[PDB]
């Protein structure tokens, strides 16, 4: 190691746009922090889920508009219909416990 080598390195670092003045291994973490995309900002993170409300609501509307046909919801429907016919329904809110 020489002073010539240290000057050469300070020059290469100042030139290529890397960190100029000597730093701790611990402080370089801030360089790393702003050199990257923070985790919570990545499309693999905030965009992870598809929007389930858009799909559900849209296909629900399209079903009511008679375009899309949902057999699963049809099943649920007829089952519930027969269930309220049988005499066991869903209690109107507030009625069930005390009565």
Partner 1 sequence: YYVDWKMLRDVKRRKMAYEYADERLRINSLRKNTILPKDLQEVADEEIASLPRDSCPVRIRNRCVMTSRPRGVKRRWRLSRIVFRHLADHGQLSGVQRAMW
Partner 2 sequence: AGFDDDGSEFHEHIFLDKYLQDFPKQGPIRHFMELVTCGLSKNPYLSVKQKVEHIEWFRNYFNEKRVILKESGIQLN
Partner 3 sequence: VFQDDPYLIPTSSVESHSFLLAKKSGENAAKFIINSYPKYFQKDIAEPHIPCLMPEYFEPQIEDVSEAALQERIKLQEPSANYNFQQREQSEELEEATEADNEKSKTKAGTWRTKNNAERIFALMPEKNAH
Partner RNA sequence: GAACAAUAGUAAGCACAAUCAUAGCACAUAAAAACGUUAGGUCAAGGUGUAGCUUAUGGGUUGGAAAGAAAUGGGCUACA
Partner RNA sequence: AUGACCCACCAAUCACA
By CB under 8 A, name the one of 31, 58, 75, 80 that touches partner 3.
58
Is residue 45 part of the contact set for partner 3 (CB under 8 A)? no
Stretch that binds RNA, among 13-21, 37-45, 58-66, 85-93 (CB under 7 A): 85-93
HSE (CB half, 13 Å, CA atoms) of 80?
A: 7
Measured from the CB of residue 59, what is the shortest distance to RNA in angstroms?
15
Is residue 36 part of the contact set for partner 2 (CB under 8 A)? yes
- Token readout for 94 is 């507030």
- Residue 54 interacts with which of partner 1, partner 2, partner 3, none, CB < 5 to 8 Å by class: partner 3
Strands (E), 25-78: none
CA dihedral 52, 54, 57, 60 (to 10 degrees): -90
């Amino acid at each position: 190691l020489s002073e010539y080598a240290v000057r050469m390195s300070r020059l290469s670092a100042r030139l290529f746009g890397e960190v100029a003045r000597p730093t701790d291994s611990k402080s370089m973490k801030v360089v790393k922090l702003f050199s990257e995309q923070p985790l919570a900002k990545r499309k693999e993170t905030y965009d992870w889920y598809p929007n389930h409300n858009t799909y559900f609501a849209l296909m629900g509307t399209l079903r009511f508009l008679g375009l899309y046909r949902d057999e699963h919801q049809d099943f649920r429907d007829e089952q519930l219909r027969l269930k309220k016919l049988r005499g066991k329904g869903k209690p109107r809110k507030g009625e069930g416990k005390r009565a």
